[PDB]
Design a protein around this motif. Structure first.
Motif, short mmCIF file in Angstrom:
data_model
loop_
_atom_site.label_atom_id
_atom_site.label_comp_id
_atom_site.label_asym_id
_atom_site.label_seq_id
_atom_site.Cartn_x
_atom_site.Cartn_y
_atom_site.Cartn_z
N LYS B 4 0.83 -1.19 0.00
CA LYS B 4 0.00 0.00 0.00
C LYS B 4 0.87 1.25 0.00
O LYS B 4 1.83 1.34 0.76
N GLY B 5 0.54 2.19 -0.87
CA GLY B 5 1.37 3.37 -1.05
C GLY B 5 2.78 3.00 -1.46
O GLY B 5 3.75 3.42 -0.82
N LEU B 6 2.90 2.20 -2.52
CA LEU B 6 4.20 1.73 -2.98
C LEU B 6 4.88 2.83 -3.77
O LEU B 6 4.36 3.29 -4.78
N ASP B 7 6.05 3.25 -3.30
CA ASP B 7 6.83 4.27 -4.00
C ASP B 7 7.72 3.55 -5.02
O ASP B 7 8.80 3.08 -4.69
N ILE B 8 7.24 3.48 -6.26
CA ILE B 8 7.96 2.77 -7.32
C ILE B 8 9.27 3.44 -7.68
O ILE B 8 10.11 2.82 -8.34
N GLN B 9 9.48 4.69 -7.26
CA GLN B 9 10.72 5.39 -7.59
C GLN B 9 11.91 4.88 -6.79
O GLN B 9 13.05 5.23 -7.12
N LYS B 10 11.69 4.06 -5.76
CA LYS B 10 12.76 3.58 -4.90
C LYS B 10 13.04 2.09 -5.09
O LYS B 10 13.69 1.47 -4.24
N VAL B 11 12.57 1.50 -6.19
CA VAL B 11 12.81 0.09 -6.47
C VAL B 11 13.85 -0.12 -7.55
O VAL B 11 14.22 -1.27 -7.83
N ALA B 12 14.34 0.95 -8.18
CA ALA B 12 15.32 0.83 -9.25
C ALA B 12 16.63 0.26 -8.73
O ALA B 12 16.96 0.36 -7.54
N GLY B 13 17.38 -0.36 -9.63
CA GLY B 13 18.67 -0.93 -9.33
C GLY B 13 18.74 -2.39 -9.72
O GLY B 13 17.82 -2.95 -10.33
N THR B 14 19.85 -3.02 -9.35
CA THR B 14 20.06 -4.42 -9.65
C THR B 14 19.33 -5.30 -8.64
O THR B 14 19.36 -5.03 -7.43
N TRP B 15 18.68 -6.34 -9.13
CA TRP B 15 17.98 -7.30 -8.29
C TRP B 15 18.43 -8.71 -8.62
O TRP B 15 18.97 -8.98 -9.69
N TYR B 16 18.20 -9.62 -7.67
CA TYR B 16 18.50 -11.03 -7.83
C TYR B 16 17.31 -11.84 -7.34
O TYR B 16 16.74 -11.54 -6.29
N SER B 17 16.95 -12.87 -8.10
CA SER B 17 15.86 -13.76 -7.70
C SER B 17 16.41 -14.78 -6.70
O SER B 17 17.10 -15.72 -7.08
N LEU B 18 16.10 -14.58 -5.42
CA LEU B 18 16.59 -15.48 -4.38
C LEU B 18 15.73 -16.72 -4.26
O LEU B 18 16.24 -17.82 -4.03
N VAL B 90 3.01 -6.50 -6.35
CA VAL B 90 4.05 -6.38 -5.34
C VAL B 90 3.43 -6.56 -3.96
O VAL B 90 2.45 -5.88 -3.62
N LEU B 91 3.98 -7.48 -3.18
CA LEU B 91 3.42 -7.80 -1.87
C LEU B 91 4.07 -7.01 -0.74
O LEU B 91 3.37 -6.52 0.15
N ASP B 92 5.39 -6.86 -0.77
CA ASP B 92 6.11 -6.17 0.29
C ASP B 92 7.53 -5.89 -0.18
O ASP B 92 8.12 -6.70 -0.91
N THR B 93 8.07 -4.75 0.24
CA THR B 93 9.46 -4.42 -0.05
C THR B 93 9.92 -3.30 0.87
O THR B 93 9.14 -2.43 1.25
N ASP B 94 11.20 -3.35 1.23
CA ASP B 94 11.87 -2.27 1.94
C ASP B 94 12.87 -1.53 1.06
O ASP B 94 13.69 -0.77 1.58
N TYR B 95 12.82 -1.76 -0.25
CA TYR B 95 13.61 -1.03 -1.25
C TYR B 95 15.11 -1.32 -1.15
O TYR B 95 15.80 -1.34 -2.17
N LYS B 96 15.62 -1.54 0.06
CA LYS B 96 17.05 -1.67 0.27
C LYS B 96 17.52 -3.11 0.47
O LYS B 96 18.73 -3.35 0.45
N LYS B 97 16.61 -4.06 0.66
CA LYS B 97 17.02 -5.43 0.91
C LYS B 97 16.21 -6.43 0.10
O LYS B 97 16.77 -7.17 -0.72
N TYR B 98 14.90 -6.47 0.30
CA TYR B 98 14.06 -7.50 -0.30
C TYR B 98 12.88 -6.87 -1.03
O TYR B 98 12.53 -5.71 -0.81
N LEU B 99 12.27 -7.67 -1.90
CA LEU B 99 11.06 -7.27 -2.62
C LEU B 99 10.30 -8.53 -3.01
O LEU B 99 10.89 -9.46 -3.58
#
Lengths: 157, 157
Positions: B4-18, B90-99
């Motif tokens: 809820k209230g997902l700030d899509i501007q803070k999800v950019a960068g490299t990601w890895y499928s864990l 998108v279910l949950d994210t802290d932008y800096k660790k997991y998504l």
């Protein structure tokens, strides 16, 4: 981890179905032609205290059937084998009439060979079996976890 | 669920499928599965849409695909048209660790659900897997994968 207490292997005979699987390595299950993607279809205790395991496997585009001979050991729930690059089959829990939890491992590389299965008597998805499977598995480093629906339980092999 | 209230501007960068999970086994089994995609990079657009650059093992090589997720009235629900899917939640994210996010097809959502747990670093974040396995407890998942660091680095770039 889990284990079975005073296991009577004679009360395990009959038809079984592989309801769920899990392995420590992904490559052990990922696909239908995986080395450990075997479907336990029948267990047969011997008079001498050993176990014969009948399992079906997707080979060469068809559903072949194979027999593994599990020789008994000093421990009532631990058996020794020589098949599928495994050498020890540990029974984790069973009520003889509904579910059975067991695992396979190689004593050389147990972290790259551990693969557990949850067997059921009827071709249904017994939720109680999945409870004890996930409860015994939460302590194991499984990186792939499978669970089958009735349509897949009704004759994938 | 439903970020809820997902700030899509803070999800950019490299990601890895864990870790991954799908409602059907055939959606994630083998290397060439239709939903065996490896998210590499997320790129928000000025108009609020999302660009998803993911890797897929196709035809013996690591092909790159770009899925454009168009926004909807729901801040965390996006519209796509790729991989026989039409939604991204998108279910949950802290932008800096997991998504955590999930793809599905609005026609038959019971046969098309596939969720992933993305991480910033190619390390096995245990807290991310904790919230992933907890957010999947309401979904009918039948296959669950989890990758090690060696697999997390060589899943293309």
């Amino acid at each position: 981890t889990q284990t079975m207490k005073g296991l009577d292997i004679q009360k395990v005979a009959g038809t079984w179905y592989s309801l769920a699987m899990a392995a420590s390595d992904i490559s052990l299950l990922d696909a239908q032609s995986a080395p450990l993607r075997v479907y336990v279809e029948e267990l047969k205790p011997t008079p001498e205290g050993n176990l014969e395991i009948l399992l079906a496997k997707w080979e060469n585009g068809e559903c072949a059937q194979k027999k593994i001979i599990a020789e008994k050991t000093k421990i009532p729930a631990v058996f020794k084998i020589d098949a599928l690059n495994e050498n020890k089959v540990l029974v984790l829990d069973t009520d003889y009439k509904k579910y059975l939890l067991f695992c396979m491992e190689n004593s050389a590389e147990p972290e790259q060979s551990l693969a557990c299965q949850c067997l059921v008597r009827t071709p249904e998805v017994d939720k109680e079996a999945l409870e004890k499977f996930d409860k015994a598995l939460k302590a194991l480093p499984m990186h792939i976890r499978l669970a089958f629906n009735p349509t897949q339980l009704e004759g994938q092999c």
